[PDB]
Design a protein around this nucleic acid. Structure first.
Ligand SMILES: [Mg+2]
Lengths: 49, 390, 34, 147, 54, 1319
DNA sequence: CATGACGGCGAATACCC
RNA sequence: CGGAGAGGUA
DNA sequence: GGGTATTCGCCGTGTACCTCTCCT
C-alpha cells in the first residue's frame, strides 16, 4: 500500500485537470481557446508547431 | 498501490467491480494496442483513433465525466475515478480526514435520569464493560488475577463478579463524552461521570437536554471514552456539564429548568385566596414544610413566615437580616434550597420559566459556579417532586 | 429556527435634528432642504 | 372581519380561562388567577403558548392556500370541538408546508454552518492586548417608536 | 489543504500544483487533517514551543 | 340482522352518517393491475397480448421471411409460494408463446408463403403475484409500489418571470409521449419560438415546420391572417374587416360611407367598433408611409421578366412598395399584426430561421441530433421520420392521445399514437395564443395531469423492452441467416426478456422489500403511490410545490399519511375509496344529487371532471327522503369552498373517511388531532410489533375488521359450513349442502401459518378463533393472524393510563410503566431470526460440517447432534455453536449465536448440492419431511374420503335405501359389482368417480412429492451445503423501548415502576402507564385525551358486565344492561336488538364484553363529548374523566384530580436491544485503517466534522488528537496506546494517520507531486 | 440513454458600436 | 467486508 | 478595435444511526 507503479505511454497524453478545469491552464498558457486545444487534443484539427 | 484499490470478495468465490481497477485496465489495454499498432504500422486514421481513445481512457481514469460522457460500468452507474477519491462529501478529505470513525465508542437510546447530578450520566454496565475493556485487562493483570491477555479476555467474556468490581474501580472518576447528532454547537458534546446502570439505555440528566436539543421520544446518543490523562482532564475541565452552564452564543444560562420542574415550582409558588392554613404565622421554612407534609396547611396558603436572608456587603461577607415576610407556604418551603446570599424576594412570587432562569443567572452572577450547580440540582429535584405531588 | 407618509412621535421628549438646513417658510414651519 | 372575529374569540376565551372566582374567609366571592391545568402550563411557561391554547379552545382561524394566499373562510372550530373534513383538509395544507419547509431548510442551514466554520476555522485569540485605539461605536438599536 | 478540503478540490489543487504552493500547517483544519495538535486550547502552547524552537 | 359469528363481540358504533358505499377491497389496485397484465385480452389493448402485438410481426430487411405471433399461455409454476420462499427462488410461471415462421416464395408475385412453421417457444419466467398482491423474488416477499408520473400528452407551462429582466414570462409547451422523444416549444426573451427535441440545443421552431414540408407562404398562412392592400389607381386604399382595426390607435382618418368617423390621434374604442355594424366600409385609403411597418405575406414576380421582386416575410419599404406598384400588381398580401394579442412571433422566428427549404431543415435537425457526424439527405429524412412519425420509435399511448386531444379541445378521444403535422401545428397555435393572453397554462401538480402506473403496466413495459431486445437479434438472424428448415425456437432467445423481467422485479426502485411489521404495514405498502422511480422525481431535487397537498388530492390521496424527512410529499397513500380509471387517473366516488335529493347512485369522478361540479361536504344533514334539511350547504366547486343552495349542489361525498387513508382512518378522534401529530401517529401505527396476545382496541373506528380481512393475514371461510375439526394448526369445515358443487366431498381445509418470521424478523402466527362444531358463514374469520383479534386489527394493548407528572420519569415524552405490565407480558413480542451456515469449496479443500471441532470442550458441543447441528428446541445463548464447521488451513468456522441473542432453536433446514453425501441430520430431516408429505396426501385424503362417504350416505338414502347392505356389504363392492344399473347408484357413479380420482390424484403425486423432497436443490456455485437455523426470542418490555399511541404521542420508557409505587385510585387499582400532561397542549393532539375518556367509559361498561358475570346474574339483567349500552348515543346509525339473540348468544357476547365494550368512533363521524359523558354515567364513572389518585410511595392524595382512562398503546419496532452497541477495538477497513461502521460489523461510531468542530470550540486538543490518531487509522499509535492502557499508562504516542498517506498516494496517482518537507 | 432543480459565478460569445 | 438501490429513526 | 450584455458550463446543496436485497 506504499509502492506505486508507472505506465509507459506510447504517446504523450494531456492531463485532464490542467485542460478542462476552468480556466484552462494549457489554454491560458498557450493563449489558445479551449475549443481549439480540444479539437487538436481529441484529433479534430492540426497545430502549426 | 494495489492495496489502496483492493478487490472485495462476494459470495465466497467471486469479486465485484472495484470501479477503479477497470479504468486502469482500460488505459493499459488502449496503451498496449496503440503501441502495437505503432510497430506494425497502419493507416494514420486508425492510429489517430487509437491515440484519441487512449487520451479518453487516461482522462476518464483521472477525472471520469469531466469532459464528454461518463464511462459506465456493469450497471448504469458512472465509474468513480481518481478525482472522485478526494473530492465531495464521500471524498477522502471530508469522509476520512476531517472526520472519521473512532474506537472506544458506543451508542444507545437515551432515557431520563431524574435522580442524576449534573455531572453524572447513566451508563449501561454492559456498554461500559465493552468500552473500558483494555482497562479491565490491565487491572486484572495488575492484581495478577489473569496471567496473560487470553485469561483476562476469557474472564471478561464470562462476566465474573470480580470483573464487575474491576469495572467499578476503573470508571470511578474517568469521564465519558456524550454526543447527540446533529452537533450544532459545542455543547452537543459534553463530559459526564458514568454511573453504572442495569438497563441497556443511557440515562441523561434533564437539565442538559436543552443543550443537546434532546428529548426521550426515540433519540440516541453516542458515548466516547477519553483514553489519555490529557483527554480525561480536558473532559473534566473543559467539556464537563458543570463547566457548560452558560451559552457561548449569548452568555445566558442553558441549563434552565423546563416542563415538569417549571410547572412544579410555579404550582408550589402560586397563592390561593382561601387556602387551608391562611393567616398562620410560622417560625420559618421548616415549620411551613412540617405543616404542608402533615396536611395542616395548604401549599398556596398566604401566611407570615420568619425569613432569615443573607446579603454580601462591600467586604464580601454574608450579613444576615431576619424579618417577617408575607408569603406562601410553598415559597417558604422552596426558600430552603436557595443558597445564602440571595434576596428572599427572588422566590416571593409565582415562579415561571423566566423567573427561574433569572434566579439561576442571579445565583451564578453573585455566588459563582459551585452554588449555581448545587442550586440547579436542588431546583430540578424540588420541581419534579412538587409537580408529582400537584 | 429562521424562516424559509407621515411621522408621529409616541413618547415625551425633546426633538433634535442633524444634517439640517433651515430657511424662511410661508407658514413659519420649517421645510428640509438638506 | 374574520381576523377581528378571531381576535374577539381569543380575548373572550383568555378572559374566561385566566381567572377563577373564589370565596374569601369573609364569605365574599373574590377573583383570582385561575388554577386551570392548561392555563397553569401556559402561564408558567412550562409548555404551550397563548396561540396553541386558542387553537385548542377558541378557533383555529384563518388558513393559507399552498400558494400562500389566505383562504376566505376560516376554521371556526377548535380541536376540542373537532374539525370537519373540509377544515381538516384545509389545515393539512399548512401542516405539510411547514414540515416540508423544515425538512428542506435544515440542509441550507447545515451548508451555511459549514461555510461559516471554514471561513472562521483558523481564527484564534493569540494575544492579550494589541494596544489599538480604534473601535466600534455601540448605541441602542432604534426602529421607530420602540427600541 | 484547507481550501481543497472545503470545496472545489480539483480547481484548488490545480491552482496549488501550477503555482507550486507551500502550505504551512498553521490552521485548525490543516493540523486536524495531518492528525497533529490544533493551534488552539490545550495544544496552543505546544505550537508556541514549535514556533520558538524554529 | 347480525350473523352468529358477528354476535360474538359487537363493537358499539357511534357513527351517525348512514353508510351508502361499502369500503372496497383494499388491495384492488395491485390485483387488478396484475390481472390486466397476465389475463388474455382478445382485443389486445393491454397486457402481454398488447406487448406481443406491438412488436410482432418482425420482418427481415428484405422482408422475405417473417415471424407471426399466434398466442401465449402461462404454465403451471414449478413451485408454489411456500416452496419458493423456503428454497429462495422466484415464484413465477413459464411463458409459452405460439409462434409461426413464414418463409415466402422466391420469384413469387406478392407475399405468397412457401412454408409456415408452427411451434411453441419458451420466452422465460414471468413472476406471479400472490393472493395478497405480493411477489416472491428470490424467496423474498416484495411489493411493486405504484408510481405517480406526468401523464403523456401536451402540457403548457410558464416560468412567472424569474428568468430574465423583470416580469418577462416565457411560455412553453411540452409534448411528452409514453414512448419516444419529447418535443418542446418555448418563447425566448425576444419573443421568438424555439424548438427543442429531447432537451438538446434549441432550434428555431420554423425548422420543424420546414421539416414537415411547409414553405414560407404556407407557414405564414397557417399562423397569420392575410390583410389585403387593393390598389385601383393610387392612394393605397385597403380592404379590411372592422374587427381587425380594434385595439390600436388610428393611423388615418377612417371614413364611413365617404364621411370620416375617427381622425388621427384618437385610439379606437369599443363604441367606435360597434358603430360599424351598419357602416360596412370595405375599401379605406391609407397613407403610403403607413406601409412601412408592414410585412408582405406572399412571393411575387414581375409578369414575364423572371426577376422575383420580393418574397414572403419581408418588410415593405417605400422603394419596395412603390416599385411593386409600378409593376401593375393590384393587391399586396400582408400579415395582420398587433402588439398585445396578434404578435408576429412566427414572422420573427422566420427571420431568425437559418434554413430555407425542407432539405436544409432536415440537415439542421440531423446535425442537432447527431453532433459532428456527416449528414445525408436520406439519413436526415429517415431520422426525422423516425423521431415522431414511426410507431416503433414513438408512441403516444391511448391516455397520451386522449390528454393531447383534450388539451387542444378536440372532440375525438381516440387517435393515432404518433404525431401528425396538424398536432404540431395546433400545439404551436395554442402556445402562441396563450402568449397572446387567450389561454391559461396547465397545473403540473394537478391530479388530472398526473396519472398512476401500477405493477401490470410497468411489467408490460419492461417485457416490451426485453421483447424489442429479442427483436433486434431475431431480425438479423432472419435476414443474414441463410435459413432453411429452421424452427422459430432457433431464432428466439429468452435471455434478454428474462434479464429485463428479473431486473424489474428485483432491482427496480419501485420493487421494494415488503414492510411486514403488521397487517397495516402490508396494506399501506401495497397502497403507496411513489413520485420517485424511473420517469419520476428525485428526493434530493424535489421542490416545495410538488410536495404540497394539492386541492385535487381530496378523496384520492391522503393529505396526512406521508413520510417525514426527505421523502415528504413524494410518497403518498391511496385514499379509502380512491381508485384509478381506465386511463390511470385517480377517481373518487360521489353520490349524485338530483332535484335536491341525495340519491344512492354513485359516480366515480376524476380530478378534471370533479372541478366542474358543486359537491356537498360529507358532514351535511339529510332526511329520510334525501333532501338537504338546510338551505345553505358548504360545498367545493373549483378547488375552492363556499356556500350554495341545495339546488346548486350536484354531488355529495360518500363518506366522512373518504379523504383519509387506511392508517389515518384507523385513528379514533382524528378530527381532534393536529395534522402533524396525526401524520406521526399514522406512520407509527405501521411500526407496531405484534405482541404475545392480540388485544382489541377498546376505542376504534370500525376499520379494524376491513384491514384485518383484506390484509390476508387471517384465515377467511371460503364457503359456509360447520367446523368439523379444529386444532392449533388446522381447521376443517364441513361445507353446507347448499354451497357444495356436484360430485365433491364438500370439505374445506385451512392450514395455519405457525411461527414463521416476517420480513422484519417478527413472528407470523395464525391461531384459530372458532371451536369444534361452530357454524361458519362465507367471509367469516376462522383463524386470527398477527395483530388480529377475532377478525379485528389489534396492533397494541389497552393500558390504564394516568396523565400526571411522576417525579421526572415522564419528562420530555418519557413513559413510566408499571411492573404489572411486564409481569402480564402485555408487550412481550416474539422475534425470529434466520442464521445461515454455508460450507463451500476453498482452494485447499471443501469445508466440512461436523461435530469434531478443534480447540473446544465437550461442554460447548453438548447442544450439537452427531452431525454437528444444534438440536431442535435447544436453548442457546450468545457464543453457542449452532452448526459446527471446520475450514481447512483446520480452522474453526462454525456458525455461532450472535452476542446477546439468547433464544430457542425452532427450525433447522439443510440444503445439499447434487452429488454431495448428505449427513445423518439431513437424512432424518428428509425422513421427517417424507413422513409429513405422506400424511399430507393421506390425512387430507382421509378427511375428503370422510366427506365423500357422508355425501354418498346422504344420496344413497334418497331413493336407493338399502339398510342391510350398509353393514353387510363394504364400500369397494359398490364401485365394481356386476348388477343392472338404476337410479340408486347411477348418481353415485358421478360422486364416487371423484373418489376414484382422489385415488388417482393424491397417490399419483406422492412420487412427485418424494422426488421434490429428495432432490438436491440447486445452490450458488461453490456451495456444498447450507444449514439454516431459526432462533426465536421473547423480547420483554424494558426501559429504552419505544411506545406510542395512535395520535402521534410517542415516547421512550424510562423506568419499570414497582406496582406498590405506582399511582392508584380509591379502589386500590393502580394505573399501568403514567404519561406527561405537558405533551398534550403544545402538540394539540387532543384525540388522545378524548380516547382516554372514552376508553375509561368502555372499560366501565365491561366492569359492570364482568360484575354481573361474577355474581351469576340472570340473563335478563345482562340483556337489559347490554341493550341500554348499545342504545346509548345521539341518534347513532347502529341498531342492536338483543331480543333477536338467544340466551347462549347473549352469554357469549357478555363474556366477550367483560374486559370492556369495544367502541367504534369514525374519524369524522365519531362520538361526541356529550355521548362520552353519557357512557361514563352508564358505567357509574365521573363525567370529567378525572378521578382521585393516591401516591403509592406515601399513600398521600394527589392534590388535583388526574385524567385516568384507557389508551391503546403500541410497541414500536425500535427496541433498545437492537440499538445498544459498544466497541473498544475491532476490525478496520482496508484502504483506510479507520474502524468499520455499523453495529452488525461491530463497528465504531463516526466522529464527524461537526463533532471535530465542537472539540475545537472547547479547546480539547488532546481529545481531538486521540480521536484522530490512536482511536483511528494510526496503526502504530493505536497498538502502542492499547499496550500502554493494558500497562496502566494512559499516554498516547500519536503518529501520522493512514488516511493522510492514502490521500498523498491518491494525489500522486493524479500526476501531482505532493510531499512532506524536511522538518 | 433521461427528458421534474436551481441559484450563483466566471469565461466565453455575441452585439453594438 | 466496498459500492448501488429501497425504506426507516432522531 | 473596443466595451458591454447575454449565454453556457461548473460548483454547491445537514449530521448521526438502523434494516433489507443486489452486485464479474
Ligand atoms: Mg426526539
Amino acid at each position: 500500500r506504499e509502492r506505486m507503479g508507472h505506465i509507459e505511454l506510447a504517446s504523450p497524453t494531456a492531463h485532464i485537470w490542467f485542460l478542462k478545469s476552468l480556466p484552462s491552464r494549457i489554454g491560458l498558457l498557450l493563449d489558445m481557446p479551449l475549443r481549439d486545444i480540444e479539437r487538436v487534443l481529441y484529433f479534430e484539427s492540426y497545430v502549426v508547431i | 498501490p494495489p492495496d489502496l484499490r483492493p478487490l472485495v470478495p462476494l459470495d465466497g468465490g467471486r469479486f465485484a467491480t472495484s470501479d477503479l481497477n477497470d479504468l486502469y485496465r482500460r488505459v493499459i489495454n488502449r496503451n498496449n494496442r496503440l503501441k502495437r499498432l505503432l510497430d506494425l504500422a497502419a493507416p494514420d486514421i486508425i492510429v489517430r483513433n487509437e491515440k484519441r481513445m487512449l487520451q479518453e481512457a487516461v482522462d476518464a481514469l483521472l477525472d471520469n465525466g469531466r469532459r464528454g460522457r461518463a464511462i459506465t460500468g456493469s450497471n448504469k452507474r458512472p465509474l468513480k475515478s481518481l478525482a472522485d477519491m478526494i473530492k465531495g462529501k464521500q471524498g477522502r478529505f471530508r469522509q476520512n480526514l476531517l472526520g472519521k470513525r473512532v474506537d472506544y465508542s458506543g451508542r444507545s437510546v437515551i432515557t431520563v435520569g431524574p435522580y442524576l447530578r449534573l455531572h453524572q450520566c447513566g451508563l449501561p454496565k454492559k456498554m461500559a464493560l465493552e468500552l473500558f475493556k483494555p482497562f479491565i485487562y490491565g487491572k486484572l493483570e495488575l492484581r495478577g488475577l489473569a496471567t496473560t491477555i487470553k485469561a483476562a479476555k476469557k474472564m471478561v467474556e464470562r462476566e465474573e463478579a470480580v470483573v464487575w468490581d474491576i469495572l467499578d474501580e476503573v470508571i470511578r472518576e474517568h469521564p465519558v463524552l456524550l454526543n447527540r447528532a446533529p452537533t450544532l454547537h459545542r455543547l452537543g458534546i459534553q463530559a459526564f461521570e458514568p454511573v453504572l446502570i442495569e438497563g441497556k439505555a443511557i440515562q441523561l440528566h434533564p437539565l442538559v437536554c436543552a443543550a443537546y436539543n434532546a428529548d426521550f421520544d426515540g433519540d440516541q446518543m453516542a458515548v466516547h471514552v477519553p483514553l489519555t490523562l490529557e483527554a480525561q482532564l480536558e473532559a473534566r475541565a473543559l467539556m464537563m456539564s458543570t463547566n457548560n452552564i452558560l451559552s457561548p452564543a449569548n452568555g445566558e444560562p442553558i441549563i434552565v429548568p423546563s416542563q415538569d420542574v417549571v410547572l412544579g415550582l410555579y404550582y408550589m409558588t402560586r397563592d390561593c385566596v382561601n387556602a387551608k392554613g391562611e393567616g398562620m404565622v410560622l417560625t420559618g421554612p421548616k415549620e411551613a414544610e412540617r405543616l404542608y407534609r402533615s396536611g395542616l396547611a395548604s401549599l398556596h396558603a398566604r401566611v407570615k413566615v420568619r425569613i432569615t436572608e443573607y446579603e454580601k456587603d462591600a467586604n464580601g461577607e454574608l450579613v444576615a437580616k431576619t424579618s417577617l415576610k408575607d408569603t406562601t407556604v410553598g415559597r417558604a418551603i422552596l426558600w430552603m434550597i436557595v443558597p445564602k446570599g440571595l434576596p428572599y424576594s427572588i422566590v416571593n412570587q409565582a415562579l415561571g420559566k423566566k423567573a427561574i432562569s433569572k434566579m439561576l443567572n442571579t445565583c451564578y452572577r453573585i455566588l459563582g459556579l459551585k452554588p449555581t450547580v448545587i442550586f440547579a440540582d436542588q431546583i430540578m429535584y424540588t420541581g419534579f417532586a412538587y409537580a408529582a405531588r400537584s | 429556527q429562521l424562516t424559509m407618509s407621515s411621522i408621529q412621535v409616541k413618547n415625551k421628549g425633546s426633538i433634535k435634528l442633524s444634517n439640517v438646513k433651515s430657511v424662511v417658510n410661508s407658514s413659519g414651519k420649517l421645510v428640509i432642504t438638506s | 372581519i374574520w381576523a377581528a372575529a378571531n381576535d374577539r374569540v381569543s380575548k373572550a376565551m383568555m378572559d374566561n380561562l385566566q381567572t377563577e372566582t373564589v370565596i374569601n374567609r369573609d364569605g365574599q366571592e373574590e377573583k383570582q388567577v385561575s388554577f386551570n391545568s392548561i392555563y397553569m402550563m401556559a402561564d408558567s411557561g412550562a409548555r404551550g403558548s397563548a396561540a396553541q391554547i386558542r387553537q385548542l379552545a377558541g378557533m383555529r382561524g384563518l388558513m393559507a392556500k399552498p400558494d400562500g394566499s389566505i383562504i376566505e373562510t376560516p376554521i371556526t372550530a377548535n380541536f376540542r370541538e373537532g374539525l370537519n373534513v373540509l377544515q381538516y383538509f384545509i389545515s393539512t395544507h399548512g401542516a405539510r408546508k411547514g414540515l416540508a419547509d423544515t425538512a428542506l431548510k435544515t440542509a441550507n442551514s447545515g451548508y451555511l454552518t459549514r461555510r461559516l466554520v471554514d471561513v472562521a476555522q483558523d481564527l484564534v485569540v493569540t494575544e492579550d492586548d494589541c494596544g489599538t485605539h480604534e473601535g466600534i461605536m455601540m448605541t441602542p438599536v432604534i426602529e421607530g417608536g420602540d427600541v | 489543504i484547507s481550501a481543497a478540503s472545503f470545496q472545489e478540490t480539483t480547481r484548488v489543487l490545480t491552482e496549488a500544483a501550477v503555482a507550486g504552493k507551500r502550505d504551512e500547517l498553521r490552521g485548525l483544519k490543516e493540523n486536524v487533517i495531518v492528525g497533529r495538535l490544533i493551534p488552539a486550547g490545550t495544544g496552543y502552547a505546544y505550537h508556541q514551543d514549535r514556533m520558538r524552537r524554529r | 340482522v347480525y350473523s352468529y359469528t358477528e354476535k360474538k363481540r359487537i363493537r358499539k358504533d357511534f357513527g351517525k352518517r348512514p353508510q351508502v358505499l361499502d369500503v372496497p377491497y383494499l388491495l384492488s389496485i395491485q390485483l387488478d393491475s396484475f390481472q390486466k397484465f397476465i389475463e388474455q385480452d382478445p382485443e389486445g389493448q393491454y397486457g402481454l397480448e398488447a406487448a406481443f402485438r406491438s412488436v410482432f410481426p418482425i420482418q427481415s430487411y428484405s422482408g422475405n421471411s417473417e415471424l407471426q405471433y399466434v398466442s401465449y399461455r402461462l404454465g403451471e409454476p414449478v413451485f408454489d409460494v411456500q416452496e419458493c420462499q423456503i428454497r429462495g427462488v422466484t415464484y413465477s410461471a413459464p411463458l409459452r408463446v405460439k409462434l409461426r415462421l413464414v418463409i415466402y416464395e422466391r420469384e413469387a408475385p406478392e407475399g405468397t408463403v412457401k412454408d409456415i412453421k408452427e411451434q411453441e417457444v419458451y420466452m422465460g419466467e414471468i413472476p406471479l403475484m400472490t393472493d395478497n398482491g405480493t411477489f416472491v423474488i428470490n424467496g423474498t416477499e416484495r411489493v411493486i409500489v405504484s408510481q405517480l408520473h406526468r401523464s403523456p400528452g401536451v402540457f403548457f407551462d410558464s416560468d412567472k418571470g424569474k428568468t430574465h429582466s423583470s416580469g418577462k414570462v416565457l411560455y412553453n409547451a411540452r409534448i411528452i409521449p409514453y414512448r419516444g422523444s419529447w418535443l418542446d416549444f418555448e418563447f425566448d426573451p425576444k419573443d421568438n419560438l424555439f424548438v427543442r427535441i429531447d432537451r438538446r440545443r434549441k432550434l428555431p421552431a420554423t425548422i420543424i415546420l420546414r421539416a414537415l414540408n411547409y414553405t414560407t407562404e404556407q407557414i405564414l398562412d397557417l399562423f397569420f391572417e392575410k390583410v389585403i392592400f387593393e390598389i385601383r389607381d393610387n392612394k393605397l386604399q385597403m380592404e379590411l374587416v372592422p374587427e381587425r382595426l380594434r385595439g390600436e390607435t388610428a393611423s388615418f382618418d377612417i371614413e364611413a360611407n365617404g364621411k370620416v368617423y375617427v381622425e388621427k390621434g384618437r385610439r379606437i374604442t369599443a363604441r367606435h367598433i360597434r358603430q360599424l355594424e351598419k357602416d360596412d366600409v370595405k375599401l379605406i385609403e391609407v397613407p403610403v408611409e403607413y406601409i412601412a411597418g408592414k410585412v408582405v405575406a406572399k412571393d411575387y414576380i414581375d409578369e414575364s421578366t423572371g426577376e422575383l421582386i420580393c418574397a414572403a416575410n419581408m418588410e415593405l419599404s417605400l422603394d419596395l412598395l412603390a416599385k411593386l406598384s409600378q409593376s401593375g400588381h393590384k393587391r399586396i398580401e400582408t400579415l395582420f399584426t398587433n402588439d398585445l394579442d396578434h404578435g408576429p412571433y412566427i414572422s420573427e422566428t422566420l427571420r431568425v430561421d437559418p434554413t430555407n427549404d425542407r432539405l436544409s431543415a432536415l440537415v439542421e435537425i440531423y446535425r442537432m441530433m447527431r453532433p459532428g457526424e456527416p449528414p445525408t439527405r436520406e439519413a436526415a429524412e429517415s431520422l426525422f421520420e423516425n423521431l415522431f412519425f414511426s410507431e416503433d420509435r414513438y408512441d403516444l399511448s391511448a391516455v397520451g392521445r386522449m390528454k393531447f386531444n383534450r388539451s387542444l379541445l378536440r372532440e375525438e378521444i381516440e387517435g393515432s399514437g404518433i404525431l401528425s403535422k396538424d398536432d404540431i401545428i395546433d400545439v404551436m397555435k395554442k402556445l402562441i395564443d396563450i402568449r397572446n393572453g387567450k389561454g391559461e397554462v396547465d397545473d403540473i401538480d394537478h391530479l388530472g395531469n398526473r396519472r398512476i402506473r401500477s405493477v401490470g403496466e410497468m411489467a408490460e413495459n419492461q417485457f416490451r423492452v426485453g421483447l424489442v431486445r429479442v427483436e433486434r437479434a431475431v431480425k438479423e438472424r432472419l435476414s443474414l441467416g441463410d435459413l432453411d428448415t429452421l424452427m422459430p425456437q432457433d431464432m428466439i432467445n429468452a435471455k434478454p426478456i428474462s434479464a429485463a423481467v428479473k431486473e424489474f422485479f428485483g432491482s427496480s426502485q419501485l420493487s421494494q422489500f415488503m414492510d411486514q411489521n403488521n397487517p397495516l404495514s402490508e396494506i399501506t405498502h401495497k397502497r403507496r403511490i411513489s413520485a420517485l422511480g424511473p420517469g419520476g422525481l428525485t428526493r434530493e431535487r424535489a421542490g416545495f410545490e410538488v410536495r404540497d397537498v394539492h386541492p385535487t388530492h381530496y378523496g384520492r390521496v391522503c393529505p396526512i399519511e406521508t413520510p417525514e424527512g426527505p421523502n415528504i410529499g413524494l410518497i403518498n397513500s391511496l385514499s379509502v375509496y380512491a381508485q384509478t380509471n381506465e386511463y390511470g387517473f385517480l377517481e373518487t366516488p360521489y353520490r349524485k344529487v338530483t332535484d335536491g335529493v341525495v340519491t344512492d347512485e354513485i359516480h366515480y369522478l376524476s380530478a378534471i371532471e370533479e372541478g366542474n361540479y358543486v359537491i356537498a361536504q360529507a358532514n351535511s344533514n339529510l332526511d329520510e327522503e334525501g333532501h338537504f334539511v338546510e338551505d345553505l350547504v358548504t360545498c367545493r366547486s373549483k378547488g375552492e369552498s363556499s356556500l350554495f343552495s341545495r339546488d346548486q349542489v350536484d354531488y355529495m361525498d360518500v363518506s366522512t373517511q373518504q379523504v383519509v387513508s387506511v392508517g389515518a382512518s384507523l385513528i379514533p378522534f382524528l378530527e381532534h388531532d393536529d395534522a402533524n401529530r396525526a401524520l406521526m401517529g399514522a406512520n407509527m401505527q405501521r411500526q407496531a410489533v405484534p405482541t404475545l396476545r392480540a388485544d382489541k382496541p377498546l376505542v376504534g373506528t370500525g376499520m379494524e375488521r376491513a384491514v384485518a380481512v383484506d390484509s390476508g393475514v387471517t384465515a377467511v371461510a371460503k364457503r359456509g359450513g360447520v367446523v368439523q375439526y379444529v386444532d392449533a394448526s388446522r381447521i376443517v369445515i364441513k361445507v353446507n349442502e347448499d354451497e357444495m358443487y356436484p360430485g365433491e366431498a364438500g370439505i374445506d381445509i385451512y392450514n395455519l401459518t405457525k411461527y414463521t418470521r416476517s420480513n422484519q424478523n417478527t413472528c407470523i402466527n395464525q391461531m384459530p378463533c372458532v371451536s369444534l362444531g361452530e357454524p361458519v358463514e362465507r367471509g367469516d374469520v376462522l383463524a386470527d393472524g398477527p395483530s388480529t383479534d377475532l377478525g379485528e386489527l389489534a396492533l397494541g394493548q389497552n393500558m390504564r393510563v394516568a396523565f400526571m407528572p411522576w417525579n421526572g420519569y415522564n419528562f420530555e415524552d418519557s413513559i413510566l410503566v408499571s411492573e404489572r405490565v411486564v409481569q402480564e407480558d402485555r408487550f412481550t413480542t416474539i422475534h425470529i431470526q434466520e442464521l445461515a451456515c454455508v460450507s463451500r469449496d476453498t482452494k485447499l479443500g471443501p469445508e466440512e460440517i461436523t461435530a469434531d471441532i478443534p480447540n473446544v470442550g465437550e461442554a460447548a458441543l453438548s447442544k450439537l447432534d452427531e452431525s454437528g447441528i444444534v438440536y431442535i428446541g435447544a436453548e442457546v445463548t450468545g457464543g453457542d455453536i449452532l452448526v459446527g464447521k471446520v475450514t481447512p488451513k483446520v480452522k474453526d468456522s462454525s456458525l455461532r449465536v450472535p452476542n446477546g441473542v439468547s433464544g430457542t432453536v425452532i427450525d433447522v433446514q439443510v440444503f445439499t448440492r447434487d452429488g454431495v453425501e448428505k449427513d445423518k441430520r439431513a437424512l432424518e430431516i428428509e425422513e421427517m419431511q417424507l413422513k409429513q408429505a405422506k400424511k399430507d396426501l393421506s390425512e387430507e385424503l382421509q378427511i375428503l374420503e370422510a366427506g365423500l362417504f357422508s355425501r354418498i350416505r346422504a344420496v344413497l338414502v334418497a331413493g336407493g335405501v338399502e339398510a342391510e347392505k350398509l353393514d353387510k356389504l363394504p364400500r369397494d363392492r359398490w364401485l365394481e359389482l356386476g348388477l343392472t344399473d338404476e337410479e340408486k347408484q347411477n348418481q353415485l357413479e358421478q360422486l364416487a368417480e371423484q373418489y376414484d380420482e382422489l385415488k388417482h390424484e393424491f397417490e399419483k403425486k406422492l412420487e412427485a412429492k418424494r422426488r421434490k423432497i429428495t432432490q438436491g436443490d440447486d445452490l450458488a456455485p461453490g456451495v456444498l451445503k447450507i444449514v439454516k437455523v431459526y432462533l426465536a426470542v421473547k423480547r420483554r418490555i424494558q426501559p429504552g423501548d419505544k411506545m406510542a399511541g395512535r395520535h402521534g404521542n410517542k415516547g421512550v420508557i424510562s423506568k419499570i415502576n414497582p406496582i406498590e409505587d405506582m399511582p392508584y385510585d380509591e379502589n386500590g387499582t393502580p394505573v399501568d402507564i403514567v404519561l406527561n400532561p405537558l405533551g398534550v397542549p403544545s402538540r394539540m393532539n387532543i384525540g388522545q385525551i378524548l380516547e382516554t375518556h372514552l376508553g375509561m367509559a368502555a372499560k366501565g361498561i365491561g366492569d359492570k358486565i364482568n360484575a354481573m358475570l361474577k355474581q351469576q346474574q340472570e340473563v335478563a339483567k345482562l340483556r337489559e344492561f347490554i341493550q341500554r349500552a348499545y342504545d346509548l348515543g345521539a341518534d347513532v346509525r347502529q341498531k342492536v336488538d338483543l331480543s333477536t339473540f338467544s340466551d347462549e348468544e347473549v352469554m357469549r357476547l357478555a363474556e366477550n364484553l367483560r374486559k370492556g365494550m369495544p367502541i367504534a368512533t369514525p374519524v369524522f363521524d365519531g362520538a361526541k363529548e356529550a355521548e362520552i359523558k353519557e357512557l361514563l354515567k352508564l358505567g357509574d364513572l365521573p363525567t370529567s374523566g378525572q378521578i382521585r389518585l393516591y401516591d403509592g410511595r406515601t399513600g398521600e392524595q394527589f392534590e388535583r384530580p388526574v385524567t385516568v382512562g384507557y389508551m391503546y398503546m403500541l410497541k414500536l419496532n425500535h427496541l433498545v436491544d437492537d440499538k445498544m452497541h459498544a466497541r473498544s477495538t475491532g476490525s478496520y477497513s482496508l484502504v483506510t485503517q479507520q474502524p468499520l461502521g455499523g453495529k452488525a460489523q461491530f463497528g465504531g461510531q463516526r466522529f464527524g466534522e461537526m463533532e471535530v468542530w465542537a472539540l475545537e470550540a472547547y479547546g480539547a486538543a488532546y481529545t481531538l488528537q486521540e480521536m484522530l490518531t490512536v482511536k483511528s487509522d494510526d496503526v502504530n499509535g493505536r497498538t502502542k496506546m492499547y499496550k500502554n492502557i493494558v500497562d496502566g499508562n494512559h499516554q498516547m504516542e500519536p503518529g501520522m494517520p493512514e488516511s493522510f498517506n492514502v490521500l498523498l498516494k491518491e494525489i500522486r496517482s493524479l500526476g501531482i507531486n505532493i510531499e512532506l518537507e524536511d522538518e
